[PDB]
A paper describes a structure:
In order to obtain soluble SafD, we engineered a self-complemented SafD-dsc, in which the N-terminal extension of SafA (i.e. the G strand) is fused with the C-terminus of SafD via an artificial DNKQ linker. The final model was refined to 2.2 Å resolution using program PHENIX.REFINE. The SafD-dsc structure reveals a classic immunoglobulin-like fold, in which A-G strands form a β-sandwich fold with two β sheets packed against each other. Using Dali server, SafD is predicted to belong to the Afa/Dr poly-adhesin subfamily containing DraD (r.m.s.d. of 1.5 Å for 134 Cα atoms), HdaB (1.6 Å for 143 Cα atoms), AfaD (2.5 Å for 142 Cα atoms), AafB (1.1 Å for 129 Cα atoms) and AggB (1.5 Å for 133 Cα atoms). Similar to the published SafA-ANte structure, the P1-P5 residues (i.e. Gln9, Lys11, Val13, Ile15 and Phe17) of donor G strand interacts directly with the hydrophobic groove in SafD. In SafD-dsc, a conserved Leu4 in SafANte was used to mimic Phe3, and the corresponding hydrophobic pocket is termed the P** pocket. The asymmetric unit (ASU) contains two SafD-dsc molecules. MD simulation of in PapD-PapGII complex suggested a regulatory role of LoopA-B. Based on these observations, it is reasonable to speculate that the Try13 sidechain of SafD might act as a molecular ‘switch’, regulating the access of incoming Nte peptide.
Saf pili are often found in clinical isolates of Salmonella enterica. Saf pili are assembled by the chaperone-usher (CU) secretion pathway. In the DSE step of Saf pili assembly, the N-terminal extension (Nte) of an incoming SafA replaces the chaperone G1 strand (in SafB) via a zip-in-zip-out mechanism, giving rise to a remarkable polymer of SafD-(SafA)n (n > 100).
Author numbering: 30 to 150, 164 to 178
The structure:
C-alpha cells in the first residue's frame, strides 16, 4: 500500500535586510508511487482567495513581521478550479517545487513557519513544516 510522502528543505544562511524577488528560500518534494494523474500542493498561509500560489507568513517573535512567498516550479500551474495552491499534471512518481520571495522585501529578523499540504490526483504524511530563519 503506497503512501504520499512530502519533504521540505529550507536554505540556511539568510540575512535580514533587503531581499530580491525570486530568492529561493525552500524546496519541496512530493512522492507517490500509486496510479495518479498529478500532484496538488497548497498552504493554509495563502495570502488571499485570489492568489492561489502566494503565501503570507507571520513572524513567531512578532506576528506583525510578514514575509510574502510564492510556490514555483517547472510545470506547476495555479489551481484556478479550487483557487488554492498549485497543480502539476504528471504520471511521474516524484515532483518538486520551490518557495521563493514574491516581490522585493525588507525582511526583518524573525522565524517564520512554512506549511504546505500535498495531494495526489490530509493525514500527517501529506503535510510538512519547517522554520525559515532570517538573522540580523
Amino acid at each position: 500500500a503506497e503512501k504520499l510522502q512530502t519533504t521540505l528543505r529550507v536554505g540556511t544562511y539568510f540575512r535580514a535586510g533587503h531581499v530580491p524577488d525570486g530568492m529561493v528560500l525552500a524546496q519541496g518534494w512530493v512522492t507517490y508511487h500509486g496510479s495518479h494523474s498529478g500532484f496538488r500542493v497548497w498552504s493554509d498561509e495563502q495570502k488571499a482567495g485570489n492568489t492561489p500560489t502566494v503565501l503570507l507568513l507571520s513572524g513567531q517573535q512578532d506576528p506583525r513581521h510578514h514575509i510574502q512567498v510564492r510556490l514555483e516550479g517547472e510545470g506547476w500551474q495555479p489551481d484556478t478550479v479550487s483557487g488554492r495552491g498549485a497543480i502539476l499534471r504528471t504520471a511521474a512518481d516524484n515532483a518538486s517545487f520551490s518557495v521563493v520571495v514574491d516581490g522585493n522585501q525588507e525582511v526583518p529578523a524573525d522565524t517564520w513557519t512554512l506549511d504546505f499540504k500535498a495531494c495526489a490526483l490530509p493525514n500527517s504524511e501529506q503535510q510538512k513544516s519547517v522554520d525559515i530563519v532570517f538573522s540580523s
